Swiss-Prot record, chains A, C:
Chain positions found as Phosphoserine: S205
More details: Present with 13400 molecules/cell in log phase SD medium. Early fractionation of eukaryotic MCM proteins yielded a variety of dimeric, trimeric and tetrameric complexes with unclear biological significance. Specifically a MCM467 subcomplex is shown to have in vitro helicase activity which is inhibited by the MCM2 subunit. The MCM2-7 hexamer is the proposed physiological active complex.
Organism: Saccharomyces cerevisiae (strain ATCC 204508 / S288c)
Assembly: Component of the MCM2-7 complex. The complex forms a toroidal hexameric ring with the proposed subunit order MCM2-MCM6-MCM4-MCM7-MCM3-MCM5; loaded onto DNA, forms a head-head double hexamer. Interacts with MCM10.
Keywords from the UniProt entry: ATP-binding, Cell cycle, DNA replication, DNA-binding, Helicase, Hydrolase, Nucleotide-binding, Nucleus, Phosphoprotein
GO biological process, one term: mitotic DNA replication
Protein name: DNA replication licensing factor MCM6
Protein role: Acts as a component of the MCM2-7 complex (MCM complex) which is the putative replicative helicase essential for 'once per cell cycle' DNA replication initiation and elongation in eukaryotic cells. The active ATPase sites in the MCM2-7 ring are formed through the interaction surfaces of two neighboring subunits such that a critical structure of a conserved arginine finger motif is provided in trans relative to the ATP-binding site of the Walker A box of the adjacent subunit. The six ATPase active sites, however, are likely to contribute differentially to the complex helicase activity.
Domain of life: Eukaryota
Family, per entry: Belongs to the MCM family.
Keyword Cell cycle: yes
Major location (coarse): nucleus
UniProtKB/Swiss-Prot annotation, chain B:
Name listed for the protein in its UniProt record: DNA replication licensing factor MCM2
Resulting phenotype, C74 to Y/F/S/H: Loss of activity
Organism: Saccharomyces cerevisiae (strain ATCC 204508 / S288c)
Intracellular or extracellular location(s): Nucleus
Family designation: Belongs to the MCM family.
Residue spans, zinc finger C4-type: 51-77
Taxonomic placement: Eukaryota, Fungi, Dikarya, Ascomycota, Saccharomycotina
Length: 284, 96, 284
């Protein structure tokens, strides 16, 4: 079902860009703009895309536009993998970043809730306190002293979990070792903390802050003292200091009513709302 | 008995702020301004241990870059893995 | 010097058999008997040789005959290795055994001293208490858990010393591990204990016993209740029970006046005279 549906999302989007691009006549551009997108990228080889949201709102009458805009976090690999097959159909190391623009609706920090996670919402504000350029790994080569120490593998996600359980080395699932620090593909990023606009603040309220990370291509596009528009996407970072907040604290006490026996390595969680983006235009 | 060398004219200069993942493990020609620094500290160059179980010293070893030696067990029937760096007979290298 | 001399022993013996073999005319055999030795062995492929001692006493006027007959234990690999190059010159897995016959001089157990070790002396007697067939390894494949666990290596001699000190694995000299019990070349042997003849025993003296091992081809040639002639060669086996014998006991207390310091793993030795053979004829 969901293996099919996101793949049906994958194929219909694969159907979409491989069709005609722009309706306009010889007065203007005729056709094949997204087809010229890769072919002009083939000239320069910067390995990203600039695709419109508005043309996606045209064809499926918003049925597919209201399919992506809700759970984008569900739709990371499907949007990337099908486009990879579009490239090898037309073109020949290859790493991708997907950028959006032209969001019709822009909101503020006050219009953000936990139900808005995974969805796309545009936020503008005031950039303050940029930080340096630092790498990010996302490609672990970490396996034990047993022979197959060549596991190019997991922890691409936001977890420092290198070793997979089932290899076919002499190593077991409990066997874990350090990452090979020479054979991987990285990317860099910076970390700015945006402040809220002063033209939207209500009475009795100070302007608010929020952290945001620009990864890969969108580094150095930032500017302290600027108004910008963002990618709609949003993430959540685990927090630490929210203890004695107060509140009913969630915990991860696993089940013991399974395997029969003849200690307590359980954990908790308390996170915080963060923000992530890939396209930043600087209008304003 | 050891000479380390210098390289003169690398014909591309990146001043700052352009470091990428494609720049690690490579030679970069860098300019800049001298900011503050520290004093001068010693760092090991030749490392000798001494097995407190089996009497006398282990022997000289090479200073690997940014990692310790930690010789496990030898010349004691290759057992009793305790060791320590001795104070004398260790030729150092100044660090800053 | 001695690297040259035993190699000069190797080449002159390589010169010897590659020459003419028998002086005799067309009435009888003409030439190339030792050359026909391999070529007839090429028909059957039993991988041993029957060479005479008497023809070796002809050519060098006993200068080479009095070179081999004293230290044969010195001359194991040189006699084998040059003959191996004689084979590949003439013939194509190959393992060798060198057999002698026609010893001019035969002695008894009483005519054996420790100065006779390494030399060749023929002893006859009375075979008693044969034993079963049991293997012998002489090809260790023993290396540590470090990657190169493929060391086809030492303990071909009479010592259970598998691991060599300097490999180029991650394993060290102290690193040692078990032998691979599937990839080696073995041989089998039996162990009979010969008794001395009753036609040579003096007054007041009982007949005497001596152990002897027949390795490889010379197994099952033995017969309890038989008179036989042997290979001249002789070895020495370490003993245990000769303690409180009495005597000044030798020891192996190593030097401590070498490396400067800031326990006592020393040993002793007490051996016994044994015997080894490769050719047993059963005349008598």
């Amino acid at each position: 079902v969901d293996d099919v549906t996101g793949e049906k999302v994958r194929e219909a989007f694969e159907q979409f860009l491989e069709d005609f691009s722009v309706q306009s006549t010889d007065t203007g551009e005729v056709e094949k703009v997204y087809r010229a997108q890769i072919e002009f990228m083939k000239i320069y080889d910067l390995n990203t895309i600039y695709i419109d949201y508005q043309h996606l709102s045209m064809r499926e009458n918003g049925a597919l536009a209201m399919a992506i805009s809700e759970q984008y976090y569900r739709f990371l690999p499907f949007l990337q993998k099908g486009l990879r097959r579009v490239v090898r159909k037309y073109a020949p190391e290859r790493v991708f970043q997907i950028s959006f623009f032209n969001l019709p609706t822009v909101h503020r920090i006050r219009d953000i809730r936990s139900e808005k996670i995974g969805s796309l919402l545009s936020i503008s504000g005031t950039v303050t306190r940029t930080s340096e350029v630092r790498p990010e790994l996302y490609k672990a080569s970490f396996t034990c002293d047993m022979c197959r120490a060549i596991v190019d593998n997991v922890e691409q996600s936001f977890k420092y979990t290198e070793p997979t359980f089932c290899p076919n080395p002499s190593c077991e699932n409990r066997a874990f070792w350090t990452l090979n620090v020479t054979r991987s593909r990285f990317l860099d990023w910076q970390k700015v903390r945006i402040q809220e606009n002063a033209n939207e603040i209500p009475t009795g309220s100070m302007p608010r802050t929020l952290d945001v990370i620009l990864r890969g291509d969108s580094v150095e596009r930032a500017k302290p003292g600027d108004r910008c528009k963002f990618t709609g996407v949003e993430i959540v970072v685990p927090d630490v200091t929210q203890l004695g907040l107060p509140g009913v604290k969630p915990s991860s006490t696993l089940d013991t009513r399974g395997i029969s026996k003849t200690s307590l390595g359980v954990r908790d969680l308390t996170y915080k709302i963060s923000f992530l983006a890939c396209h930043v235009i600087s209008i304003g | 008995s050891e000479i380390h060398v210098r390289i003169s004219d690398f014909p591309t200069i990146y001043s700052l702020r352009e470091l990428r993942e494609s720049n690690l493990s490579s030679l970069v020609r860098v300019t800049g301004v001298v900011t503050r620094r520290t004093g001068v500290f010693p760092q090991l160059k030749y490392v000798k241990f001494n097995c407190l179980k089996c009497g006398s010293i282990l022997g000289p070893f090479f200073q690997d870059s940014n990692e310790e030696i930690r010789i496990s067990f030898c010349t004691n029937c290759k057992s009793k893995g305790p060791f320590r760096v001795n104070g004398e007979k260790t030729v150092y290298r100044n660090y800053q």
